[PDB]
Amino acid sequence: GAMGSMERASLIQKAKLAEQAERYEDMAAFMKGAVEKGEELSCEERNLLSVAYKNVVGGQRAAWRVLSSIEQKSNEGPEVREYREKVETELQGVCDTVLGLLDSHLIKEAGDAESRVFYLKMKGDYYRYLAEVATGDDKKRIIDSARSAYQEAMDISKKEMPPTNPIRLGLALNFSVFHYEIANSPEEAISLAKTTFDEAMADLHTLSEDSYKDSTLIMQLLRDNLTLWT
Amino acid sequence: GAMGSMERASLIQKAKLAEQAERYEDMAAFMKGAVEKGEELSCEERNLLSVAYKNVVGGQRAAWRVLSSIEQKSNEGPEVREYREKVETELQGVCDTVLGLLDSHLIKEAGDAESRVFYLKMKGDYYRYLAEVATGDDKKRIIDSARSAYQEAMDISKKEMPPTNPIRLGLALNFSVFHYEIANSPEEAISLAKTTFDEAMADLHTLSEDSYKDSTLIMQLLRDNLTLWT
Amino acid sequence: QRSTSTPNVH
Amino acid sequence: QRSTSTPNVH
Numbered sequence A, B: 001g002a003m004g005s006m007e008r009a010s011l012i013q014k015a016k017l018a019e020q021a022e023r024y025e026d027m028a029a030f031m032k033g034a035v036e037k038g039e040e041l042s043c044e045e046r047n048l049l050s051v052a053y054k055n056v057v058g059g060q061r062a063a064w065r066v067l068s069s070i071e072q073k074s075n076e077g078p079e080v081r082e083y084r085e086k087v088e089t090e091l092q093g094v095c096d097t098v099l100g101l102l103d104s105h106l107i108k109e110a111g112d113a114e115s116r117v118f119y120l121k122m123k124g125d126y127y128r129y130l131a132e133v134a135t136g137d138d139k140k141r142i143i144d145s146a147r148s149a150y151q152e153a154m155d156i157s158k159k160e161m162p163p164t165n166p167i168r169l170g171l172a173l174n175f176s177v178f179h180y181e182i183a184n185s186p187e188e189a190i191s192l193a194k195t196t197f198d199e200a201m202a203d204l205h206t207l208s209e210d211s212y213k214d215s216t217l218i219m220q221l222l223r224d225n226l227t228l229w230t
Numbered sequence C, D: 001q002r003s004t005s006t007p008n009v010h
């Protein structure tokens, strides 16, 4: 890659500068380069990677939704479809890049429970983003891949992490979204969200000093979804 | 270019879709392609061009300012300078692209007073953006080019447009900013801004039905600068 | 309205 | 604080 000549530490440093400058594409490129050095990522580095690529794909998803809505309205000239397909192709390229990094470099048998859960959650997420724009035979493969990644992350989190852990909570939130929005399973979405919230409250004493703000934020977002869904 | 096979009208249509999707890079590319068809741009099309490229360069300027501030603070490792230079190079590339379009395609002897003023204002602006990041021999050339473009736009606007015209007002605003921020001439900035505001108020009756909101907005921005500068 | 997923922080 | 230049509209 184009980051091959740069020291790992310089790449991390530049990802942080890019974050500060809100240059999320640059940030994602710097972190891709850091990952490709083939060393494990710390918590702080996983956050950089996550933030960078979520910003990039988030912008593409929001654009895609705008174009898709215009397209659907005009089916009640080829230009709307063509531009939607262009944005879609770019979005898929970004998801494929992330899934490639996860598969080539980041997902392992060893390491932290946290790290393993986090990367499998990320795999679930970027398959879900592919599923939002998918149509045919490709789609059922994609949905199955998301569920599989999420379900494995869930099994590990439930055995190895407290119920208030932010990765555990964030994973459960995103899986419930999957169930509701992608898998068309509102009952499973609701049950997971409810169970996740109630078990965190029941073991509220497990909140960590260094992450309790994150935990409580996700608990509120679980409650917001539950209110929207019932 | 990559837009060469696409119909002009499809390019305009896609610029509008890109604007709606907040995909300003795509928007700028579509409008560059439309310009390269070599026909004049309407008012609506000039706005598309303006909005697209200002969004692109605006994001680069804001990033550059962030990095430059970090850099200056750390001069009280090469990575901050290197990344600043990278963003700077990209910004300069965008300005060169715009100035190239203006020179190759858009600025003419003929056409609307409006159109001629608007393109010379745009030339002044993108030279000013180059001047913000320039240093040496290159800089004085750049500042002279901005002043020259602005001053010619001013001469035409004063002879051919009412004092409330939004292009005339927008040009005067941006030239006053040039005087204050680039040319280090606060007295000339203030006098231009004051004169522009007072003459618009004196001939307030010239407000146009289709643009009076724009005119009054720029008048307020002139007043905001005057308050900041005195 | 869309379901809310995990946001970006820090 | 920076001087305000012409903004984007429409």
Ligand SMILES: *CC(=O)NCC1CCN(S(=O)(=O)c2ccc(Br)c(F)c2)CC1
Pocket: A042, A043, A044, A046, A047, A050, A114, A115, A118, A121, A166, A167, A168, A169, A170, A171, A213, A214, A215, A217, A218, C006, C007, C008, C009
């Ligand atoms: C220690 C560690 O692995 N830290 C990095 C990750 C990156 C973000 N995830 S998350 O996507 O699950 C998440 C994001 C935002 C909030 Br408020 C969360 F609670 C969780 C967790 C930690």
Ligand SMILES: *CC(=O)NCC1CCN(S(=O)(=O)c2ccc(Br)c(F)c2)CC1
Pocket: B042, B043, B044, B046, B047, B050, B114, B115, B118, B121, B166, B167, B168, B169, B170, B171, B213, B214, B215, B217, B218, D006, D007, D008, D009
């Ligand atoms: C008819 C015509 O030429 N319309 C296009 C231009 C594009 C924008 N300019 S401007 O940059 O001078 C400007 C921008 C925003 C506001 Br609120 C203005 F008043 C002027 C003017 C018209």
Ligand SMILES: [Cl-]
Pocket: A082, A083, A086, B014
């Ligand atoms: Cl397209």
Ligand SMILES: [Cl-]
Pocket: A014, B082, B083, B086
């Ligand atoms: Cl760099």
Ligand SMILES: [Mg+2]
Pocket: A006, A007, A008, A009, A037
């Ligand atoms: Mg290295």
Ligand SMILES: [Mg+2]
Pocket: A088, A133, A135
């Ligand atoms: Mg498709």
Ligand SMILES: [Mg+2]
Pocket: A202, A203
């Ligand atoms: Mg207990």
Ligand SMILES: [Mg+2]
Pocket: B006, B007, B008, B009, B037
């Ligand atoms: Mg054509």
Ligand SMILES: [Mg+2]
Pocket: B088, B133, B135
């Ligand atoms: Mg330089």
Ligand SMILES: [Mg+2]
Pocket: B202, B203
């Ligand atoms: Mg009069």
